[PDB]
Amino acid sequence: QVQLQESGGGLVQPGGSLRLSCAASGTIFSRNIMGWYRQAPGKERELVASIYSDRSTWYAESVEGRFTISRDNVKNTLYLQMNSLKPEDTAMYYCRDRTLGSWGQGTQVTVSS
Amino acid sequence: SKPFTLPILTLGELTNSRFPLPIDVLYTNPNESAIVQCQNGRCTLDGELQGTTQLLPTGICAFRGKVTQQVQDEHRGTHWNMTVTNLNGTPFDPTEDVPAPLGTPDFSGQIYGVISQRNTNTVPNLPANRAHEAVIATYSPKFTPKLGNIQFSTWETQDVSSGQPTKFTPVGLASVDANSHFDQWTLPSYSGALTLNMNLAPSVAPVFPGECLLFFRSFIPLKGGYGNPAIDCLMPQEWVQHLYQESAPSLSDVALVRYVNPETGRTLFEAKLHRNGFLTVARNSAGPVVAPTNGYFRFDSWVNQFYTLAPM
Known part of the structure; x- marks a missing residue:
């Protein structure tokens, strides 16, 4: 029974703030590498952020300085703070256990006027 | 079994293992890929020296x-x-x-x-x-x-x-002119025209598509003439010495390593450290890798071949 469930998606005004969460279940969470993907219509699934066992983080150049990924090994939840949003960030955000390979359902994040 | 680890040296604290030179920059070359089968600076992750690789930097x-x-x-x-x-x-x-x-x-x-x-x-x-x-x-x-x-x-x-x-x-x-016959990836004929080379270290190539070899590049002086020649090694001499010391058994064919900025603890990019002793990255660009010299490679964990490298 391994499942990843995203939460906190929706619509927001450009330049605002939004936070995504991802509750992991049935995995060795603390050992695995967690990451956040996104998929725009007509585009591929590009890796945005990634966090490792030693809580070290990785970010994309088109994201760096804005988004923040963190993990909670106690509650087995993966977060993603998204500040200063842009209309180019409008896509489908998926959370993934990069070690095990298990994907999530994915939530929708749109930024328009 | 002894846990595998890498030496904590920055890029400015490493030397080339194929020529007595300091490591200047990291380098990839997806275009014009040749058969990489160098004999110096060859050491498996479990501490086995291959080819003509020896421990002395002055050797x-x-x-x-x-x-x-x-x-x-x-x-x-x-x-x-x-x-x-x-x-x-x-x-x-x-x-x-x-x-x-x-x-x-x-x-x-x-x-x-x-x-x-x-x-x-x-x-x-x-x-x-x-x-x-x-x-x-x-x-x-x-x-x-x-x-x-x-x-x-x-x-x-x-x-x-x-x-x-x-x-x-x-x-x-x-010299590096036409008659100089300078090719970095061309092995000499150790026995001359008498017979072919033997006991060579195995060739090196990236397995998965979209991945290319990650080289440690050093620029080499010239007696005269024009040019900016370079020597690329698979691993720096410090790594060869370190791997020989610990002699840690390899648990997988590929080990994930991370290039970390120590000032902020940030992971700049990922890389695959293969069993035979070389690095591959998921990079599309070529030439020098733009990265702070104070950054260092850190062993993360052993991985299976289901793991995909982050875009570099």
Whole structure:
């Protein structure tokens, strides 16, 4: 029974703030590498952020300085703070256990006027 | 089993393992990929030295032996024949499972350095010495380290003694023109035109598509002419020494490593450290890797071949 469930998606005004969460279940969470993907219509699934066992983080150049990924090994939840949003960030955000390979359902994040 | 680990050295604290040079930048080249099968700087992750790789940084592209005689020739320059041994002084045994005496250059070109001698006999009570610039052509038919005999040339036309202990100290390259025959990924013929090379370290190539080799690049000096030649090693000499020390058993064919900025603890990019001792990255661009020199590689964990590298 391994499942990843995203939460906190929706619509927001450009330049605002939004936070995504991802509750992991049935995995060795603390050992695995967690990451956040996104998929725009007509585009591929590009890796945005990634966090490792030693809580070290990785970010994309088109994201760096804005988004923040963190993990909670106690509650087995993966977060993603998204500040200063842009209309180019409008896509489908998926959370993934990069070690095990298990994907999530994915939530929708749109930024328009 | 002993846990695997990497030495905590920044990019500015590493040296090339194929030539006695500091590591300048990281380098990839997805375009014009050749067969990478260098013999120096070859060490598996479990601490097994391969090819002609040895531990001494001063032993890379170095030679020790005695000058036999002066080669009489009407051609330009003055050529000298030199028997080579092991770096420690012991005679080289060609029946050993090695491509050449350890430390022997693993690429085609004109190696520019200094030949020095110190006489065995003593005169009322110190030995005489001499040192001159010299060039060693690894593409030459006379270049036969496997047979325990190479040949070098000098601008000096007399001041070289025979039967005296001779040392070669690598400095750089004589030239990188058309007739210089400088190719980084072209192995010399260790036995000359007599027979093909044996006991070589295995070739190196990225398995998955979209991945390319990650090289440690060092720029090498030139005696004269135009050009900016470079030498790329799979692993720095510090890594070779470290892997030999711990001798940690490899749990997987590929180990994930991260290039971390120590000031912020950020992971700049990921890389695959393969069992045989080389790095691959998921990069589309080519040339030098733009990254802070104070950054270092850190072993993350062993991974299966289901893991996909982050875009670089």
